Symmetry: C6
Subunit: 102 residues, 6 copies
């Protein structure tokens, strides 16, 4: 499901922010020789799924229609204390209130 260099073998490091992830997302796409429309929805589906579950959760959180920028800001912070500062608090409240998960 994606050969080396192909935008399909492109993924946001588990810790890689969206801002860092995104840059290369398209650099490796440019490596892929696909029409814009071919790469377009790829630019979309490959980006988000391969965008590190912290971001995917955010991206999905931003609700569809999100802009590469909107997701970018929310999932950009993914990586440094910018986002993590908050996630430690929420992850913490993810267990305190939501400890029971079914």
């Amino acid at each position: 499901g994606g050969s080396p260099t192909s935008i399909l073998d492109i993924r946001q490091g588990p810790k890689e922010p969206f801002r860092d992830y995104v840059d290369r997302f398209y650099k490796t796409l440019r490596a892929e020789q696909a029409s814009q429309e071919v790469k377009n929805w790829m630019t979309e589906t490959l980006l988000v799924q391969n965008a590190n579950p912290d971001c995917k959760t955010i991206l999905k959180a931003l609700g569809p229609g999100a802009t590469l920028e909107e997701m970018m800001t929310a999932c950009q912070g993914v990586g440094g204390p910018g986002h993590k500062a908050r996630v430690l608090a929420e992850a913490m409240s993810q267990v305190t209130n939501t400890a029971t998960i079914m």
Copy 2:
């Protein structure tokens, strides 16, 4: 919204400290050819809004129109045991008293 290398793109990384983000910001603002008043407010609107939810929200935390010193000290602590530490024990207290959020 925001072209590459523009002060608009300029986004304090999450971990990106204010003194750091702020340093490349203005170096970058210098790079975008804008009028004085244009850079004058970009220096503002792009510095606080795209200032990494930690620093950014800090500026807003300090209170709007915050003196560069107020956002600087407050955000110049972003990335160190000075501020980062505050986030570890404090967010921890956001879930202690403020865990119930609606």
Copy 3:
């Protein structure tokens, strides 16, 4: 057996991402002059096992059938806020309820 430079000796770094470790494994694997199928069943048997208990455990966790992509998506979650948030989330309440372990 499984001395250095062998896909056997190929163990995802403790923190080496499935995206990297897979590359390492697949880089040291190619370096390993094994039959194609041999590499493939190593890719199947060695990978899952010598893949960093975080990814490794996941591999088994996704349940058999995990395409290289499934173990990839699941083991790609591992390494940052995406998954770490969760590991922290469970290791925390596993201790709370599941503290009693026999």
Copy 4:
């Protein structure tokens, strides 16, 4: 209030240890063209104030009159488990007992 390269613009990176930040301060101070006395008092009034709220709170904590060595010893520990750990332990207990803050 403080131009670039001036000791006024000199600020201990949040994580920047005092040992590193002191060098950058004085190295930069050398760069700043201020009388020996003017540099000497910057060395005092600037070094402390722009010394990373962590080392900065340590300087005051050591108590005014702290010899550069005193702030150095205490503010040198800033940046690693040396100080960061102590902070984790103190901040940790600052929320346990001191959580109520007015």
Copy 5:
């Protein structure tokens, strides 16, 4: 007894992977001139004792009489979420239930 570089000094960077440390042990062991066997038992007695108190601890948990491989399977989990996660949960529940220690 045991000066720098001599395997005796050979120690796992506490965060250093067992695999790397071990490589350092063995890479440097080769550097420490001994009888074939002498280097080997060092490989045993020194490695466990000087391999990151966590791995040092794992090894004992790996079963006195641990093979270099077994500990390799476990200590490899060190330096990674494999262990960072596990330690977090255990230290977490040990203090909670086992808080009273005598």
Copy 6:
């Protein structure tokens, strides 16, 4: 409290391992023109106190009679889970039980 480059000015980075620090110090000590004996009297008191509050305290923690074997063997874990697993496992029991400190 020690001139630059002198073994007196030799200080284990707050994160600097004792292994690295012990090595920095001894090289620096050789650089430090302390008599053959003075270096030995330096290698003793300086090495213990300037070696990063984490080790430094450990050195005292090992209790008097701590030979390089004790401080190196303890302060070795400094930097990662070896020494630190204790910092995180015990801190948990240092604040929970010992939070009240007078």
